[PDB]
Amino acid sequence: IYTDAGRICRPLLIVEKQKLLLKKRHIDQLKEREYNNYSWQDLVASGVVEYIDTLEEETVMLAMTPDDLQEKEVAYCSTYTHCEIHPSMILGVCASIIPFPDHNQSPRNTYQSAMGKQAMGVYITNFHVRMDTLAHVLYYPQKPLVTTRSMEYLRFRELPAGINSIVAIASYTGYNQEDSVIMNRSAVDRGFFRSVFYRSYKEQESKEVFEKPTIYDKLDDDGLIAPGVRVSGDDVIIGKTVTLPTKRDCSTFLRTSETGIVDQVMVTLNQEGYKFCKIRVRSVRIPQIGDKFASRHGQKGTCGIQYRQEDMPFTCEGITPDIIINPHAIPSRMTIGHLIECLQGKVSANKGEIGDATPFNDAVNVQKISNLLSDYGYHLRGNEVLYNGFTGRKITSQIFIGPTYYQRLKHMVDDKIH
Amino acid sequence: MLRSTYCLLNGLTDRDLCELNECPLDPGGYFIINGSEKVLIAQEKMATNTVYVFAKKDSKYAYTGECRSCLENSSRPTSTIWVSMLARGGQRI
Amino acid sequence: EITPDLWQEACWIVISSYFDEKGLVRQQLDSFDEFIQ
Amino acid sequence: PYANQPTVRITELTDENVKFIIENTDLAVANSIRRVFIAEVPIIAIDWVQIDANSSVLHDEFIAHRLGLIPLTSDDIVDKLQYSRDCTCEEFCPECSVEFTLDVRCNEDQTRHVTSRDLISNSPRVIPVTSDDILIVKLRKGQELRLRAYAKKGFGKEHAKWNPTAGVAFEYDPDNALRHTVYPKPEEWPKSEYSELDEDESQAPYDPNGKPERFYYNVESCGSLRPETIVLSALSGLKKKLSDLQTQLSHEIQSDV
Amino acid sequence: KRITTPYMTKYERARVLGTRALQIAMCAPVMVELEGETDPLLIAMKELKARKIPIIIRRYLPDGSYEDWGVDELIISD
Amino acid sequence: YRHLALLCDTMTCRGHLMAITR
Amino acid sequence: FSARTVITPDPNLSIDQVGVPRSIAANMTFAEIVTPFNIDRLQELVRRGNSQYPGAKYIIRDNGDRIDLLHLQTGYKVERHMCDGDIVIFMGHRVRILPWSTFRLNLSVTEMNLHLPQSLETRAEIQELAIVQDTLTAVRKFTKRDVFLERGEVMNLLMFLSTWDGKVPQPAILKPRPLWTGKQIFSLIIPGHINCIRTHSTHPDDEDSGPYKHISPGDTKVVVENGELIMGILCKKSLGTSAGSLVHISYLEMGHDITRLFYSNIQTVINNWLLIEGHTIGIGDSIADSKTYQDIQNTIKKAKQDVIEVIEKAHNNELEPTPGNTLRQTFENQVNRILNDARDKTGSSAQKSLSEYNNFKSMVVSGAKGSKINISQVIAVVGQQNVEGKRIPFGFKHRTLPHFIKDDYGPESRGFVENSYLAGLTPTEFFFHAMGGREGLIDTAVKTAETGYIQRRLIKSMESVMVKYDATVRNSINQVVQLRYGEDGLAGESVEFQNLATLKPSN
Amino acid sequence: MIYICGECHTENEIKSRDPIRCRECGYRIMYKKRTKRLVVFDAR
Amino acid sequence: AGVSQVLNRLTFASTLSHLRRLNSPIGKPRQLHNTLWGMVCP
Amino acid sequence: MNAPPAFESFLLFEGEKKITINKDTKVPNACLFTINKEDHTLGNIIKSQLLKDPQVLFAGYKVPHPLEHKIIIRVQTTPDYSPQEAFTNAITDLISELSLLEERFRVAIKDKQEG
Amino acid sequence: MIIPVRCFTCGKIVGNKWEAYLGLLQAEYTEGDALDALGLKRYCCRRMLLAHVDLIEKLLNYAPLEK
Ligand SMILES: [Zn+2]
Ligand SMILES: [Zn+2]
Ligand SMILES: [Zn+2]
């Protein structure tokens, strides 16, 4: 018997001889969770679900799913004492972002879990009031067209990090190497992954005074520039002078030409009562040809080159792909999970309902998605006839094009030129 | 620590959070030390008050029995004894 | 009494109840509450 | 060695899109017409923003980009106006720019939907396409947005903000008579909109002597320019570009000879 | 007695072209007729194939005995 | 084979087996 | 000294050329001394000033005084912003200035810093002393007999040949329409007069033994005569660097200086042709017909039945163990062999399923270096997951996962993934594959560090070994390592694989 | 110089060596307003 | 060392992952054990 | 500070010529036209119109670099027919083609309305 | 944050359709029927309108800096 802190456990179902303790009445009660005070604690106290730790896991023989393990078939094990609520719960927060993770290989899932930590997007709802250094906010975050039910509880749709873009998997002009991708310049002008980078500088004075020395033109009478002024390279945003026992200058520069526009200025008294200041400056980051973007399946990849809409290839309906990616990168960076995500995204966009990418579903496979896509006047396999942008010639090989969720990453040329 | 039972944000509605400049979706569970949001990462350690039998190769002991023991953080955070047996290369415990 | 072919919605609303009852950082909050109390 | 005789057959005429067919023409000219549709048709869009006050939850350049991405009805104003570098005036004049003024204050408790309808332009003939309205920003109580903008002349090469077309569906040879695409499974490919084949026959027989004619165009306007006006302006611009290239080539030839 | 390969090594070529280019960049007299192209490297190589480079190469044997070689008699495969 | 022969003769010309400098 | 920036590919650049942003180019300068026949251009640059890019920054007189940015004369060392044609090192590359702010290179041999030397001697010596699975597929598709190019397409491809003589070859077909062939275009790409024989990957061994041994029924062994592709499909072994390939033979015959031009011409022409022909990958490339899928499922079921029979016989344990191993090792070896051979057979069947149109086959037949297993996993079966060279260990008490029974040695447990990536992995298979991938990541992480340490140790071991002027190899302390390099005193990059033709044949 | 508060949003006057303290508000975290100078935002 | 670092506030998913993570005592824990099923994200 | 503005993509820089004619010495009766600040539009139509001319041996266009707004058009024609007048005839043919197309499009617009 | 104007792929106006989109959503109109009624035939416009996250209300929940 272990009652000490530290041990790790997960809650999961309790099974009778061959039946679950979870009945239809519990489901009905949980359906109207509000105005009924019937929460998960009541389910635990009802002897339906219980917490099993690693120690008890050896002594218990779990059931993966109740749909076809307690039924009557070729006998494998009839002493099912416990059942998992859902296998997809084995994944973590970052692993739940991947759609159809079972269709990928584990290195790709690990790589995407790493990428999602540095994926650019809105991070908190109150980013305006708070001042945290090295903050990135995306212009137009979007829900993925292909999502997992776990992401419902991660509040990803509440505030996401990434944009759904029309991605075609083609080799267009050679700027589409194993990692690089080529995006639509006109659509970037329309708002691909446009971001604001907030940087916060904190300064304190102590016995140092905030005063404008007699470039310092933008400085106010208080020694601090008012917010809303465009600051270029080699510019002073904070006017601080320290007494010299004629006066030494201890001002702060813009850290090697970090161009931007000052957003907010704050002055307050510290614990000692000395006045300190905080400057939040926002810089506009429009995706250049050095910014790195990653799908939910595939390695980190910089932008190859940006083509305008007329340069970009177009389908019979004039849908120029948002981003063209390397077909040859399937063995290297991205898997067929990316292709299935594109197919399900096309199906969801045509149908309207957001596609479900539950890892272990057994009811949403490639064939059903293909049939759904074919039902909407499209090729079942997601291929489409594309026309060359430069010459207008009909490309011999039909390009696989569909909407896919892409994520801008913190690694940018604008961040590292300074 | 944020969102704890002793924090001011405990038991606050969405409007209450979005009238004191706080994100309702913020999970909390972190401290604010010198204005910096610091999170304590659970450290992995060997379980206490349990007997483990191991077999080291280079060590002269064929089998070693270890048991880290405490009195629920009352004092002396480490207190372990070993019950080993010498290799015959006669089994002296 | 039984939930055949309806298992998906049942288990997902069960997970929903677990998550909106406890949360994501429930372990840290519970540990801190135990430490303080 | 000389020109063919193109024919234009318009099937659908609508305030938002035009569907037509160009016959007896080579593929490159049709592709260039599509290219000029997308990129080389000058329209008017807001390009100089000065925000006097912005209390909204959106930063200033967000509002500037949204304003610049709003279409403005410029069916006949583009011809009268001239480009900034082609105009020898001060930074702005009414002859090379259009002035817009926005001034909204949310003094009411409910959210104020500051839309393109609140954009007031001195020139009456050029206005946002609304006269639903293009939602610019949403203002909480006590939030005020005041700004002055100038809209200039430009085309899609400068920026996508000056793209007049919304969707340019360009097609040719709906049935693979020329076999420009090799379908691995032709039976599973959906029939084109302009396909003349029967249900049983998935693909047309190969035509060894065939070349691309009968290009189908579906040009959808964004509201800033009539699609027929879009096509006419595109043709005029391509003709002007070719005439300028003629002038430069003749000058260089007579200089070198 | 002068025993050594008659060819000129890649490293020898690199150093002799570098030294000749540096000299002619310091306005040393040039023995080959000049063209309109300006780059000192190009005139260095074109005087090289002209076979009138005014520098001999000393080749040090491992023991320490030198062995002079006029660049005129160093035939070039490339 | 030239590289392997050079490597082997480099650390066997001393008259006895020698380890790498490391 | 310099500014580091991420590298972005640019096919239009030369293989020896690097694209440098104008800002980084103007950030650091190259020092040049005044020459009587370059005074005008240096005067123009110094008149332009530091405000513009193609200018200069500092001037040093004969006395060493430094002047910031005006008379220029002999002996003045002025540092000017680097321009096109300069040499920089990270191997030296020619500098080309491009608008945006990223370094650009071609990826054909396989964030980083760059440096440009100041003195002319080091520049000259670096100048004199200093196609990755991407164009191979399009080359393979381009050399197909099916490739016929129209007059305009031929002209467009021809314009991208830097070594083109300007004479348009007569098309392979004159009537009814003038149609060229991709083989003709690549023949124009091939420089000089190269003669090469190289069997294709698809080329079976029975073609030579039987008839049609050089009329090539299945577009068999590649033959190139007089520097032009007579026949065959150019796969990786026939184009990539290897023993007696087209690139290798062309290099050894007439110089890397134009082997680089061969690379550039191949890349440009192939990219421009693929612009109209197009290449893609999608769902349909993993939907191999129901016949092959049923065959794969039947083979997997047979393998599972064989493993079950082995387990039940091992329970009856008559089953005399093989010598040199215990029962556990022998039976684990038997199970592993059964699973591995079943996986290999399923993968081979899946690869043979792709007849002509599958886009995966294009990479498989050409880039078969390490892509065969990935394709087999994608279509046929992921395969057995191994940890430490063995199946999944019993982490729990005699049980891999709590969802199985105790002492379960069947294929379902122990980490065999019956389903492929398309069909999706079961949660147990997903966890076992996660374990396998974690082991692979650990192995790669340790292997890279160990390989780097070994490389550093080895290069430090014999960094001072040099070939002396007496055709002898000596170290720093001047001991003769070898009387002649390689026991023959001859370079290792100018040799080839050959056959004696008199050692094997009988008397 | 006109200077605003943090929660009551009432303008306050702050001079040199003036402690940060809003009048009749009780709050001491506070902000400053926008500039009146000309600034150009390109609508690209 | 290795405990109580600044919270990762770059993404909400990043913040959630940082708030839910585990550090091994070692400064063979390299591999992923079978017992981590359900306990720890693989 | 590094990002190139959008106006110079089509605007002609001062001191640089719009079109430059260079004689191709290595092929008789051949020429190269370097046209600055132009995309694939004019190059493509000019190449197609030149191929329409049966008195040309070679006719093509190239963009050496997408980032550099410049096109190289190679024209090789028959003897007693220099590429210059071939280029002039092709561009005049394009102008006449576009004029006729514009007139017929106006006629079609008139017919479609109130009809 | 707010509904984009001129959806990125093709450029069709979608910034004036968000409010009508929500009005149709509150009605019996389903997702696909609402998208068709708004006139977004191309699936890029449907992607733009469907996947959009309206963070503007969440941001406006906080009190403004100036009253
Ligand atoms: Zn004017
Ligand atoms: Zn106050
Ligand atoms: Zn659209």
Numbering used by the authors:
A (entry chain B): 614 to 820, 827 to 833, 844 to 874, 888 to 1060
B (entry chain B): 155 to 243, 253 to 256
C (entry chain B): 16 to 52
D (entry chain C): 2 to 132, 146 to 271
E (entry chain F): 50 to 127
F (entry chain A): 1395 to 1416
G (entry chain A): 361 to 429, 438 to 458, 470 to 489, 500 to 519, 537 to 913
H (entry chain L): 15 to 58
Copy out sentences from the published article reporting this entry, exactly as the authors wrote them.
RNA polymerase II (Pol II) is the enzyme that transcribes protein-coding genes in the nucleus to produce mRNA. Nuclear import of RNA polymerase II (Pol II) involves the conserved factor RPAP2. RPAP2 and Rtr1 were also described as phosphatases that target the Pol II C-terminal repeat domain (CTD).
Here we report the cryo-electron microscopy (cryo-EM) structure of mammalian Pol II in complex with human RPAP2 at 2.8 Å resolution. The structure shows that the highly conserved N-terminal domain of RPAP2 binds between the jaw domains of Pol II subunits RPB1 and RPB5 in the downstream region of the Pol II active center cleft. We observed unambiguous density for RPAP2 residues 48–155 and confidently modeled this region including side chains. In addition, the N-terminal region of RPAP2 contains an ‘insertion’ (residues 116–128) that forms two β-strands and thus deviates from the corresponding region in S. cerevisiae Rtr1, which forms an α-helix13. Residues in the RPAP2 insertion are conserved from Drosophila to human, but not in yeast, suggesting it is a metazoan-specific feature of RPAP2. The interaction of RPAP2 with RPB5 is mediated by helices α1 and α3 of RPAP2 and helices α5 and α6 of RPB5. RPAP2 residues E63 and D92 form salt bridges with RPB5 residues K85 and K81, respectively. Indeed, superposition of our Pol II-RPAP2 structure with the structure of the Pol II elongation complex (EC)19 revealed severe clashes between RPAP2 and downstream DNA. Together, these results show that PIC formation displaces RPAP2 from Pol II before transcription starts.
